[PDB]
């Protein structure tokens, strides 16, 4: 035959990697260039913006590194958008912009900076940057945590970036990965970026399914029909959501009802039962062997 690969010596000399690296969640090579802070700052908090695009949700958090583990100071989820008038389409580019804007305005409310650094209110998609006002507290600055997501042009991770910048956060960025950036001539179109922010790219597809075939329209989009979201008013719907986010960005926690304190889990079996299993296994194998002879 051939030699066995995973022998006794394989596991003896095997070094396991980090638990997050084994699960494939952290990118520690990039994390070293990330949130950790220069030694002449002496616990100056280095804030970073964590944006994760999930299958049914979009998570936007702001955290800074600590020795017990990095701490979330503010978070915003895409499922909070039903409160702000966005029933469905919670994972598109337009939903990432609203999630980033909700995180942006919520953080400024908790720091007393709601009135200062308003940001973009009449969104166009241009190259906007927040500038600190003299005689006033400085503008909040942070950096984007792309994670393991491939950052190409038009990524939803940069959609939450645009919502955060327009909310009053000074995040260093370049308008190369935003949608509408023409690759061949190297220029950025603000109107095309506005359409993706306003969800008008989805509006073209739903209208495209009107002319081609009705059956694929109901299969591809079902809750759009159920919640009565035609392409016409999504530009009005997102403007309603943008105004609703800025007027009340504070979060209210759901009340915690008393838990029944029951274990759905399988408890770990103790040593005495472990030692009893092999005594019963050995005794039964002997008497079953006795019936054969």
């Amino acid at each position: 035959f051939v030699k066995v690969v995973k022998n006794k010596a394989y596991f003896k000399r095997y070094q396991v990697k980090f638990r997050r690296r084994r699960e494939g969640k952290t990118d520690y090579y990039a994390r070293k260039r990330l949130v950790i802070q220069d030694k002449n700052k002496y616990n100056t908090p280095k804030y970073r913006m964590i944006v994760r695009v999930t299958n049914r949700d979009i998570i936007c958090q702001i955290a800074y590194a600590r020795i017990e583990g990095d701490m979330i100071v503010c978070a915003a989820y895409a499922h909070e958008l039903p409160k702000y008038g966005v029933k469905v389409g919670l994972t598109n580019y337009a939903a990432a912009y609203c999630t980033g804007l909700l995180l942006a305005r919520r953080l400024l409310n908790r720091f007393g900076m709601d009135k200062i650094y308003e940001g973009q209110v009449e969104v166009t998609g241009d190259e906007y940057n927040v500038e600190s006002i003299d005689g006033q507290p400085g503008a909040f600055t942070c950096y984007l945590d792309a994670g393991l997501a491939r950052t190409t042009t038009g990524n939803k991770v940069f959609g939450a970036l645009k919502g955060a910048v327009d909310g009053g956060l000074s995040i260093p960025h370049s308008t190369k990965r935003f949608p509408g950036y023409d690759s061949e001539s190297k220029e950025f179109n603000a109107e095309v970026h506005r359409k993706h922010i306003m969800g008008q790219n989805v509006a073209d597809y739903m209208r495209y399914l009107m002319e081609e075939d009705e059956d694929a329209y109901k299969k591809q989009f079902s809750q759009y029909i159920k919640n009565n979201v035609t392409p016409d008013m999504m530009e009005e719907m997102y403007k309603k959501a943008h105004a609703a986010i800025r007027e009340n960005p504070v979060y209210e926690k759901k009340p915690k009802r008393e838990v029944k304190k029951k274990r759905w889990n399988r408890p770990k079996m103790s040593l005495a039962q472990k030692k009893d299993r092999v005594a019963q296994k050995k005794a039964s194998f002997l008497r079953a062997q006795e019936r054969a002879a």
Partner: protein
């Protein structure tokens, strides 16, 4: 004669421990260092920038200057009958806090805790550390069993 290389004879000393290779743990990078912190030095082979010289391995010094990615540490080196208080620039990967100093800083707290306390009570509590004194007179109980006898075993050739 031997060579005068920077890393001559550093085969095992700068090497990584068994099954401890790979990515450097990130808690070293996010540990603070102030001026005058007692710091011991232990070289790491993963990061080749800012490695201390082989004469500073295992030594303990104090920090005087802190840069972005490294700190400056005053260390003592014996050079042919004299000790030179010299300064080196060592990167953060090579640096741990020395836990020799905290025991004195720990002990000062209970010396100060027992100084302000019991001053109103007047009880004189001993504060100086004492070496292990001779044990006092005590009684050993042999209740029941008599102390059994030990016999030197006869020799037998094991091999």
């Amino acid at each position: 004669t031997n060579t005068k290389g920077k890393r001559r004879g550093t085969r095992y000393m700068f090497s990584r421990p068994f099954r401890k290779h790979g990515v450097v743990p990130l808690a070293t990078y996010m540990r603070i260092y102030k001026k005058g912190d007692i710091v011991d030095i232990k070289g790491m082979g993963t990061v080749q920038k800012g490695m201390p010289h082989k004469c500073y391995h295992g030594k303990t010094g104090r920090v005087y200057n802190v840069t972005q990615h490294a700190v400056g540490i005053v260390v003592n080196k014996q050079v042919k009958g004299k000790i030179l208080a010299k300064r080196i620039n060592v990167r953060i990967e090579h640096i741990k806090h020395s836990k020799s100093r905290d025991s004195f800083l720990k002990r000062v707290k209970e010396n100060d805790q027992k100084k302000k306390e019991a001053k109103e009570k007047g009880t004189w509590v001993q504060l100086k550390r004492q070496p292990a004194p001779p044990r006092e007179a005590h009684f050993v109980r042999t209740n029941g069993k008599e102390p059994e006898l030990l016999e030197p075993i006869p020799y037998e050739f094991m091999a």
